[PDB]
Amino acid sequence: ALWQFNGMIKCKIPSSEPLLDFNNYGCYCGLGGSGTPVDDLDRCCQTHDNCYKQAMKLDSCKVLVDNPYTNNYSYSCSNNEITCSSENNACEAFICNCDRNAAICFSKVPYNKEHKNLDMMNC
Ligand SMILES: [Ca+2]
Ligand SMILES: [Ca+2]
Numbered sequence: 001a002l003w004q005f006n007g008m009i010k011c012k013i014p015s016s017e018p019l020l021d022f023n024n025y026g027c028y029c030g031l032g033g034s035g036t037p038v039d040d041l042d043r044c045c046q047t048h049d050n051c052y053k054q055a056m057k058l059d060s061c062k063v064l065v066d067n068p069y070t071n072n073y074s075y076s077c078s079n080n081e082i083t084c085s086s087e088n089n090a091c092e093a094f095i096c097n098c099d100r101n102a103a104i105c106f107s108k109v110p111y112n113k114e115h116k117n118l119d120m121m122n123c
Contacts, residue, residue, distance in 0.1 A: 001072045004096075008103040011077035022106065026115050027123040035123025038115050044105035051098035061091035068095050075100075 009018040016022075026042030027035045028049055037043040052068045055061060061071075073092035074085035082103060084096035 001070050004073065004075060005099040005103070007077070008075070008082050008099050009106060011080055011082055012103045012107045014080075021111070024117050026118065027120075035120075038118065038122070039112055040109040041106065041111060042115070044102060044109060047105065048098065048102040051101070055091075055095050055098060058091060058094055060089070060094070066091050068098070071095055 006018045009016060009022070022045070023030045026038045026045065027033055028037060028042050029045035033046065033049055037046050055068050061067075065071075071092060073088050073096045075096055076083045076085065082100050084093060084100060088096060
C-alpha cells in the first residue's frame with residue numbers, strides 16, 4: 001500500500017518527505033505521466049509507473065480489491081535496508097518488489113529542483 005511505500009522511502013532516505021518531494025516532478029513523478037524523461041529521477045518514476053501497470057494485470061491479484069495503492073503487505077526495514085516478508089502471498093510479493101526497486105532507484109540519483117512543475121509542452 002502507498003503508506004508502506006512511504007515507509008520504504010523513509011527507510012532508504014531518512015531526510016526526505018516522500019509524498020511532497022517525489023510528486024509533481026518531471027514528466028513522470030506523480031499521478032500519470034508520458035513523453036521523454038527529463039533526467040534520471042524522472043526515469044525511475046517512469047519505471048515504477050510501468051511496474052504498477054504490470055501489477056494491475058497480474059492474475060494473482062484480484063481486480064480492484066488487491067490494487068497497488070491499498071493492498072497491505074509484510075515488510076521490514078533493517079539498517080536502512082528493505083526486506084519483503086516470505087509470509088506474503090503472490091500478489092502482495094510482486095507489489096512489495098515494485099516499491100522496493102523504486103525506493104532504491106530514488107536513493108541513487110540526483111534531485112534537480114528546476115524540474116518541478118514542468119508544463120506538458122516540455123515532454
Ligand atoms: Ca507517474
Ligand atoms: Ca494484503
